[PDB]
Design a protein around this nucleic acid. Structure first.
Ligand SMILES: [Zn+2]
Lengths: 129, 204, 151, 101, 62
RNA sequence: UAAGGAGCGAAGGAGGGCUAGAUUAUUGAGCAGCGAGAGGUGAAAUUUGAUGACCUGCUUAGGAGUAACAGAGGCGAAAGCGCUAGUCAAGAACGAAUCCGAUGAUCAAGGACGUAGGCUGGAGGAUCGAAGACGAUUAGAGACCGUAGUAGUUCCAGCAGUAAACGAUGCCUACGCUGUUGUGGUUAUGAGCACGGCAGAAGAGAAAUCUAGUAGGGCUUUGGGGAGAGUACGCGCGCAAGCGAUAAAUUUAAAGGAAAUUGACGGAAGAACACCACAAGGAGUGGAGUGUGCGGCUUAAUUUGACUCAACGCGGGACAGC
């Protein structure tokens, strides 16, 4: 019946935390925002698939209030000269949005890769543990 | 104090494609048309070719970018601002045992806009042949690259943007390159990789 | 996680509140979110160690996810009365007894604490019992000590 | 005594090579010596493809993949168990490993 | 609410999970084309009938 | 001349100097949206945020770098060299009926180059980070880990002269088994020439292994049981830091000397196995009173062995006398 009213959803997924943030198609207006660390207590759980899932539900609720129906997803890790694998939690944000009623448009990996780069932290020997 | 209540939606419109209207954007309500211009003009968005055309599901690998230019009532009108291939396509294309050929060139539209174009091609391993790799010799790569630049100059230099956009849609430059350069060596995956707007002329 | 243990209420005729640093507590695992099946006694005199040789007052393994949970008591006492009783630190209209430091768990509830009262007349009332959040005693000189709305 | 004929690295007929940085600890390691690993991972997990089939607006959809090449120093490769210690006759066997997902 | 699908087990594959508690199984639904892969935890015999809550959730590892 | 140098033809290469451009990325500022946390770890604290962080837009300013392709691939005397065009010299190899005719090999003294870190002067200053300062951990950490931070890290003109500068294998020139795979030219399409990788064999060697086979070919460097010692005195270079070159007295039966064999050990890796292991299930012990053993204290004496499994109703140890 109804047309598909679309929003953008950005997802950042590092080793330490996950950040979820919905915007208009222009990226220049913000509709809702949450993080894993907002909902959980212990610092070691901010990357947890569970904390990501709790934080996604709050964002899904506010979007349903503002009257949105469909979503495009752009997802990333940290990149630059650092790690460029998508962290834990990133792939549970997406599955949660699908259990909520939302129709999924398109998914894209938008991690910032460098053609060559500045020097990384850690010294010539690296972390010793 | 629910600021969200106090916002005006406007519809985004585009040209030289089969689909005219693509979505809508918010702003806080304002008294003066001069303010609304200064708030909306300068914004940008991107759309996949598969969303703004009726087409084979294969053509999803390309994105177009548009910049807000003008306001009329409910509608914001937006103009061409570049082209880009999707990350999955770029990363999936590169393979071990083959050579990449790459180029950068600058061109000028009749309208006066200056564009910068990035191009890619890959070598191909012939059939009925048993060597593991099909690398291209360094001097031969310079022959291909020299040819690519005259093809881009012939196709796009001194044209209108209405003409350029349809050439990009139909992928004519890739097709021409594969035809023309076959005499030097066999090639595959010939594509325009990115188009970037460098200078726009001071106009009213 | 850090939790402050306050003693709250309306205090009359009371010089100091002293608290046994022994807490029956309900704990929840921060890994699997399951509550521990029984309350655990957290005591300041209980000596345990983390797997990194840090002193803690409680070491408990989660029965479900096998994760280690640790709690340390920091007494907030300003002094020891008779070398035995931790005098809770007076803060405006309440008393700060201790700070509980949880690792790998949340403290969901403190059930009870053994409380002792020093009156303004220097009389000790050991192991005071609250009836419906009220406690009151009178001395042989008709001085009243009371705690009302105990929390 | 000399443990390996190739000194544990792939350099021959050269003086010097570019360095790269270890994924796990950021140590510098020469490119011709570093342990290499290839990954091709779907953006969407296998346990969600049955929901994707009812969530998507398109008639059919192909999930996007993500591609990586990772580099490791000797200590990290041994500790993460990408490689293991082997007997004096096994050391000589050379075979290509699988691409991970 | 009491939605349910009845499915017939055609094969068992692997003892699975910490301590080997589960069994990977292939199940065909009784009134649909669908055939799934699932983990089940009790003792199971081939040709058993099992009641599922979802016809879609799957154990792709097979 | 299957000795050298000069020259011709077509072609190949991250070899070098210069000129003009480039896609991203990391920081910093401006402005806009949003309204509570971000960062970091094995786990946390220093630390930063309502003077609006984080994240998402648009603008800008700088200084480094050239990902993936990318290899037992290429080039260079070695040290070393990876974006694109244009420009300037010289070199290596190959093809062939070009020219001159012993012009050659190796080398004390003498001369030129030499990663990085360092020093003298100018330019500049993104990222990283000796020193210095904190937060944790520990008996103590001055260290490892985290926050922050300076000299340096980049460029031009020079000084310096060391590296596990290593394939730990000097340079010319010989004689020498097979199969396979590369790179660049040429081809009667059969093959060759230059530069490589790999796998056997035969010989060799204390073995491990083989740049190590055969041998009165030529020339230079260089060692003579451990220590003291690459140290003292003198001398030469250098702005300094230092470097080059190099002794005695004294002490001692071997030397963490070399490779290979068997054990013991490890805080390794890989397969197996078991309700005196676990997982899924039963009954308890740990709390009370009493019975009994062990430590501690007392006493005239409270006699004594045994201490992870594998000490503690154990010593056939239920003692009024025995
Ligand atoms: Zn490492």
């Amino acid at each position: 019946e109804q047309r598909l009213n679309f929003a953008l959803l950005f997802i950042k997924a590092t080793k330490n935390d996950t950040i979820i943030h919905a915007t208009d198609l222009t990226g220049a207006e913000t509709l809702a925002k949450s993080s894993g660390g907002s909902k959980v207590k212990a610092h070691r759980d901010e990357r947890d698939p569970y904390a990501a899932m709790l934080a996604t539900q709050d964002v899904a609720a506010v979007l349903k209030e503002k009257g949105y129906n469909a979503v495009h997803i752009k997802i990333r890790g940290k990149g630059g000269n650092q790690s460029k694998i998508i962290g834990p939690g990133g792939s549970t944000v997406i599955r949660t949005m699908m259990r909520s009623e939302f129709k999924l448009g398109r998914v894209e990996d938008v991690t910032p890769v460098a053609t060559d780069s500045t020097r990384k932290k850690g010294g010539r020997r690296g972390r010793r543990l | 104090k629910d600021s969200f209540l106090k916002k005006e939606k406007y519809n985004l419109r585009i040209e030289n494609f089969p689909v005219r209207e693509v979505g809508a954007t918010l702003v806080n309500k304002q008294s003066t048309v001069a303010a609304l211009e200064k708030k909306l003009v300068g914004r940008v968005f991107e759309a996949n070719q598969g969303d703004i055309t009726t087409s084979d599901s294969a053509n999803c690998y390309r994105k177009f970018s548009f910049k807000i230019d003008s306001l009329a009532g409910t509608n914001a009108h937006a103009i061409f601002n570049g082209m880009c291939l999707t990350s999955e396509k770029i990363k999936g294309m590169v393979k071990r045992g083959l050579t990449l050929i790459e180029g950068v060139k600058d061109v000028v539209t009749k309208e006066g806009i200056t564009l910068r174009i990035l191009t890619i091609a890959q070598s191909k391993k012939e059939k009925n042949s048993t060597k593991k790799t099909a690398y291209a010799k360094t001097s031969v790569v310079k022959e291909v690259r020299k040819n690519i630049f005259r093809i881009v100059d012939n196709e796009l230099n001194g044209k209108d943007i209405e003409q350029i956009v349809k050439k990009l849609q139909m992928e004519t430059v890739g097709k021409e390159i594969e035809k023309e350069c076959q005499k030097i060596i066999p090639l595959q995956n010939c594509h325009v990789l990115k188009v970037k707007v460098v200078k726009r002329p001071v106009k009213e | 996680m850090k939790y402050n243990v306050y003693i709250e209420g309306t205090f009359s005729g009371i010089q100091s509140i002293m608290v046994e640093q022994v807490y029956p507590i309900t704990i929840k695992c921060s890994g699997c979110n399951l509550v521990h099946k029984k309350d655990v006694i957290l005591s300041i005199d209980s000596i345990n160690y983390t797997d990194k040789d840090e002193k803690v007052n409680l070491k408990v393994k989660c029965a479900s996810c096998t994760r280690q949970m640790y709690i340390l008591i920091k007494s907030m006492a300003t002094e020891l009365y008779e070398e035995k009783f931790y005098c809770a630190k007076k803060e405006d209209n309440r008393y700060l007894a201790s700070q509980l430091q949880g690792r790998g768990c949340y403290i969901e509830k403190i059930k009870d604490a053994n409380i002792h009262v020093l009156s303004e007349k220097g009389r000790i009332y050991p192991d005071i019992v609250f009836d419906e959040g009220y406690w009151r005693e009178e001395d042989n000189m008709n001085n009243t000590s009371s705690i009302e709305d105990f929390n | 005594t000399k443990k390996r004929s190739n000194n544990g690295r792939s350099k021959k007929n050269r003086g010097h090579t570019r360095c790269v940085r270890c994924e796990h600890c950021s140590a510098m390691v020469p490119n011709d010596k570093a342990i290499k690993k290839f990954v091709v991972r779907s953006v969407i997990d296998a346990a969600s493809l049955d929901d994707l089939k009812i969530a998507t607006i398109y008639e059919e959809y192909e999930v996007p993949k993500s591609y990586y090449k990772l580099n490791y120093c000797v200590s990290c490769a041994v500790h993460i168990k990408l490689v293991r210690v082997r007997s004096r006759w096994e050391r000589k066997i050379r075979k290509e490993q699988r691409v991970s997902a | 609410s009491e939605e349910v699908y009845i499915g017939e087990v055609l094969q068992t594959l692997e003892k699975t999970g910490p301590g080997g508690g589960l069994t990977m199984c292939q199940v065909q639904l009784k009134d649909q084309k669908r055939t799934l892969y699932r983990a089940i935890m009790g003792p199971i015999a081939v040709g058993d009938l099992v009641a599922l809550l979802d016809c879609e959730r799957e154990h792709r590892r097979g």
